Amino acid sequence: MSWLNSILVTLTSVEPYKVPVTVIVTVTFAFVCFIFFYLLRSIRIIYGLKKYTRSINSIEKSAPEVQLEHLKSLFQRSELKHAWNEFEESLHSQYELENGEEKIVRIRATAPSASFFSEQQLVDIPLNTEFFKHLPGILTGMGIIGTFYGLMIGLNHFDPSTPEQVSSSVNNLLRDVLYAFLGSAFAIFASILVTWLEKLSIAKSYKYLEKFTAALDSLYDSGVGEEYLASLVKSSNESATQARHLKESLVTDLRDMLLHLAESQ
Template identity: 40%
Template structure:
């Protein structure tokens, strides 16, 4: 026991640095590698469940609440899903086909023809568009187009109400990568921005251990007694040698941890990309042009209905009948 205590007292710097290295390594394994392995299993399970849904074809009746609770089980996934789910809309596949599609196309064509004719009559001058019906009544050709447009809008509404949507599919407004990001699903849960500096910390601790051993050896080096110089020199070499061994261990661990970190993060990023691809397969994002077209058509229909209601509320008076 006295021999052990004397050894610890003599090589205290080596044991101190070694203890610090061990603590850093244990914390790295417990706080980074362990959660990374759990995240790997969780993402693999999520991707497998999404793959089953995607391979079964279009799902018009996907239970989004069940998908959130059973598939998106972790807090980061649920947070991303809540934002992504707000972009989902159930779209009918027959919206641009059959009678409904033809009616939509006719409404769009009549709208373009009406405003083209209106622009031609204006000849570049500014027009007051607050009363389109009055502008249309001043020109027989415009009045005819306006009447046909109103009839087409009414027919489209009738068809949309009477035509059942036999097949529908959830569609997203944008790609899943905008919500299910690597930062939210991997970097933040694993605290990768912190633990990526662990190799540098280990290297620094190893260098400190080397200099501490060198300083401790030089402080105890006694050259006043020529008979003990050789023994003191041997002791100095042993002390510095142990310090270099500890430093080599720290640098080796730093290299190993760097490789582990890059491998782990690359694997998790790949799983997140796979998750994004499965979500885009399940909820095919619509192109921006489709959304603009739908918004334009809805605006045109709303405008036509508004003017029709206003015309019915105005007092009846002499009107120019379209020819």
Template identity: 30%
Template sequence: MKTIVDMNGIMMYGCFAIMGITLIFYIYFYGKPVWEKIHEVEEFSSLLTNYSQENIDNNFEELQDIFNNRGILSEIWKTYSKNLVVTTTTTGYKKIYSTDSSANYFNYANFTLDLNTKFWQNLAGIFTGLGILGTFAGLTAGLSNIDLSTNDVAELKKGIASLLGGMNTAFYTSLAGIILAIL
């Protein structure tokens, strides 16, 4: 009897440990890089406020330097800048034309290319699955110690206590899985 109750606790804490470790990996390998990319784009956007449509052509080299020193933006810029045509007007001003839309390069898919987003977007399902796994493991462990063929009340009480312990595991692992899936 004591072994089954202990087993429920081990399963419950095991599921919690797996969920906790997965959450830490999520924060470190996805949350942190996403935050860094957001910060990089915000910083770059603030630098772009110094330019207007009228002066951007004549400050093209300066703008290129800004792009080339910006991590993910520098790789996207290198690809996009191959489509730029720089001409000089008769009055000596530079004019820059693009043969392709910038939206084809500066987009969600290119910004998140190195983040393995398909895996991380499925993490909610993984947490839910772990919660369901804990639910079935807890209920199975709880039901395994009930002997319904006995007439001994003390033995039935032990079985019911085991079942309640399994339900406890089932409830908490399901709750943890759902909460982590929502986050």
């Protein structure tokens, strides 16, 4: 068709040096986007997790109410406010009557902290890891497009009709192959560098998120429900024993009292 003829003739005339320039510009834009949206954000997130973990470990040996207020202040002015609120809901406070007052003597965990401070919410979504694991492939695709186009241009211009212009045809073809190879090498280098950087950063992010959630888990012991069930079972048994003993004591007291009544009569 005429439109496709025009498209082919305009793509055939593209000057070969422009393809590697376009590839390098687009790949540099992708790399700057990677740095701004992924790497710097991941560095900030790792630092935030480290600071949170230092804060959590600093109240390890504090009173439970002091711990609760400190953690609430730590998370309240942050994007982790709701995760902390839900985790604190999962925290069961055991109360004992001291000095006529109901006071928290212990806090019990019923759930791991990672069920509230998840990798998805804390790392994957903020870093857009769903997309950025595909970026090295994206760069490789740009590279193959640019390099294949450059090689096609070079081959199309390589047309020696006589032996005497073989030298010039070789020289021009080598220039075009050099342009295509420049595009490919830049794209693939950016792909490998991006892969390295983002895998390293994601591994560090997961490591420090594990440290954060482990610091939260270290604060409060679990297993309160089994203790409650054991207490209930013990209470039922001891209540049977208590009922028997109370009946025997009541019988003995009634006997002694009626003996006293008979003596008085």
